[PDB]
């Protein structure tokens, strides 16, 4: 019994366990996880169409909004479901050959698969409406998406390990995520905000990731200065190292 084999078996078990819980009992979760993006699409199209037309006459609103909204939804889902993974299956650690990290990575892969399915469905329904869906540079987009996924999973694991035995922290990080919806500039193009507050907004790694994903997805998309991938990449690597180290230090204390 190699450790990889039992790890894969428990991951598949834990994975389908998270699936059953997250998806509806009547096989209906696809309905709401497809309804969440379209409502935001409708309200932002009915609220900011002419503003985007005044912004730039080059890229239409639906595809530009989807290509930033779906990665942000994946990031927020990764953080939220990852930080609550350990304090949701406390009765599961009674059996041996299981660890909290198995639960957190099962939730991570479930969220990744669900959001990938939603992204593919949105791209298909966008191409069915005569829009532009094919990425011009797909490899850079894949790399940016991988970096964003790693950053989100790392932040979720860090919040899961750090905020054990204090649920109240999980209460406040949600209110830290609401302004991040508007700070990241996913809805409106960042080219319109004046530079007077740009240097404070360049410290958001997801902002850099979203602009780089849009640049790699669209042909002839202008990226402003200081949107290098180096800063979010280093942020993700450092946070992942810190979270893995903190989990390794507080290993036996985590499972109880």
């Amino acid at each position: 019994r190699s450790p990889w084999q039992i790890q894969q078996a428990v991951l598949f078990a834990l994975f389908l366990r998270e699936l059953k819980t997250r998806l509806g009992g009547r096989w209906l979760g696809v309905f709401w996880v497809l309804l969440e993006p379209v409502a935001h699409i409708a309200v932002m199209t009915t609220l900011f169409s002419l503003a985007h037309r005044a912004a730039m006459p080059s890229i239409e609103y639906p595809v530009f909004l989807i290509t930033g909204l779906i990665p942000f939804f994946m990031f927020r889902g990764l953080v939220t479901r990852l930080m609550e993974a350990i304090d949701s299956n406390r009765g599961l650690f009674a059996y041996r050959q299981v660890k909290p990290i198995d639960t957190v990575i099962a939730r991570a892969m479930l969220e990744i698969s669900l959001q990938s399915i939603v992204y593919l469905i949105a791209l298909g329904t966008l191409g069915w409406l005569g829009f532009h869906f094919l990425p011009v540079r797909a490899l850079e987009l894949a790399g940016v998406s991988a970096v964003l996924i790693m950053l989100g999973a790392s932040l979720g694991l860090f919040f899961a390990v750090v905020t054990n035995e204090i649920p109240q922290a999980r209460a406040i990080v949600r209110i830290s995520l609401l302004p991040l919806y508007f700070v990241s500039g996913v809805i409106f193009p960042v080219h319109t905000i004046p530079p007077q507050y740009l240097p404070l907004l360049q410290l958001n790694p997801v902002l850099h990731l979203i602009e780089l994903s849009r640049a790699s997805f669209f042909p002839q998309y202008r990226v402003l200065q200081g949107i290098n991938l180096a800063y979010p990449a280093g942020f993700a690597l450092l946070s992942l190292f810190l979270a893995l180290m903190l989990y390794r230090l507080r290993r036996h204390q985590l499972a109880s």
Binding site: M245, L246, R248, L249
Partner: peptide, 30 residues
């Protein structure tokens, strides 16, 4: 600004010390 620079250096030294302390607690775990 002697005092502001000293305070900033103290803060960054405390953060660096904390980081290496947790690292050296991790590696020492067999």
């Amino acid at each position: 600004r002697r005092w502001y620079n000293l305070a900033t250096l103290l803060v960054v030294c405390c953060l660096i010390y904390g980081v290496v302390s947790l690292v050296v607690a991790t590696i020492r775990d067999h």
